[PDB]
Design an enzyme around this catalytic site. Sequence first.
Site, PDB file in Angstrom:
ATOM      1  CG  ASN B  86      -1.898  -1.122   1.194  1.00  0.00           C
ATOM      2  OD1 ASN B  86      -1.890  -1.913   2.136  1.00  0.00           O
ATOM      3  ND2 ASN B  86      -2.714  -1.253   0.146  1.00  0.00           N
ATOM      4  CB  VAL B  93       1.514   6.276   3.043  1.00  0.00           C
ATOM      5  CG1 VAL B  93       0.830   5.098   3.691  1.00  0.00           C
ATOM      6  CG2 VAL B  93       2.972   6.301   3.428  1.00  0.00           C
ATOM      7  CB  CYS B  94      -2.205   4.082  -0.721  1.00  0.00           C
ATOM      8  SG  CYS B  94      -3.879   3.897  -1.370  1.00  0.00           S
ATOM      9  CG  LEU B  95      -3.969   4.709   6.339  1.00  0.00           C
ATOM     10  CD1 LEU B  95      -3.962   3.198   6.412  1.00  0.00           C
ATOM     11  CD2 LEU B  95      -3.128   5.286   7.455  1.00  0.00           C
TER      12      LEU B  95
END
Lengths: 156, 159
Positions: B86, B93-95
Site C-alpha cells: 500500500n 502512503v495509501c491509507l
Amino acid sequence: TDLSTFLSFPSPEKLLRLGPKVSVLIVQQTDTSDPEKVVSAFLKVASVFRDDASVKTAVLDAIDALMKKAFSCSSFNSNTFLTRLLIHMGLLKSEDKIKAIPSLHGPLMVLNHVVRQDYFPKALAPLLLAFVTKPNGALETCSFARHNLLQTLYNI
Amino acid sequence: SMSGIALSRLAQERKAWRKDHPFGFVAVPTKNPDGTMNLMNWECAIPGKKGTPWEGGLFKLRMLFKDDYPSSPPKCKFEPPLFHPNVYPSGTVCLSILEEDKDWRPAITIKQILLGIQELLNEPNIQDPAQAEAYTIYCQNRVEYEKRVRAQAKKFAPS
C-alpha cells in the site's frame, strides 16, 4: 503528419491507411526510451486490434516493432513500462489518478502475443500475472483473451 | 489561500506531540533555509511494531500539509519509498484516513496518523494495492514477502 491523426483517434481503418511502413513510422515518431510514451503508443495501437486478418497482422507487427525497440534501449525501464501500463489499463491505481482506457480486449489480445515474444523480459511475467489474475480487478468476467494470457503467464 | 488556521493547529499539534508521543517515534517540523521553523513540512520516523518483521527498523516519512489542513489530511511520503503493497513507488502512503473524501477528519492528530501508518505496515490492504512489486510477491509467494520485509527492516535499523 498523417500518423498524428491516427494517434489522436485510433482506428483500424486509419491504421491500414498509414501504409506498409506503419512499423517504421510508429517506431520513428515515438520516443522509445520514455516508458510513459511507449505505453501510450502501445495502448492506442492495441485499441485498434481486431480479428480481421488484414488488421490483426498490422497491429501485432507495429507492436512488435515498437516494443522490440523499447525493451532493447538500456535507458528504458521495463518496470515503469509495466507499472504505467497496468495503470492506464486501470488495473493498478495511481497518484495522478489517470483515466483508464475504455476497452481492454485489445491490449489483452496483444499482451498474449507480446509475452510470447523473445523481446519480452520474462521477469515481468509475474507482475502482469498478479494483476491480470487479480480476482476483483477491472477484469470482471470469463474473458477469452484473459484465459490465454493467464495460461501463457503461468506457463512461463 | 488561507494558511493562518493551518500554522495554528500545526502549532498546537507540535505541542501535543511533545507532551507525549509514542516510543522510538519521531515527528518534528523542518527548518526553513533562513533558520525559522516550518510547521508545513515535517520529518518523521516510525519504528517497526515490535513482534512484527518490521521490528527494529526506523522508517522515515515526510508530512506535508496543505493550506487546507485540517480540512484536508497531510501527504505522508516515505523517504525513501518502501517495499509495501500500500505504498506507491513515489513513496506516498495509501491509507484510508489520509483521503479527505474518505475516513479523514480534522480531529485526527499526528500521533493518530503515524500510528495508523505503523499498523498499515503489518496489516496491508491487498484488496487495493498502490504498488505492483510488493503486491505480486505478497500474493504469489507470501513467505518470500516476509523475508523481503525483514531485510528491509534490518536495512533501516539504526546503524
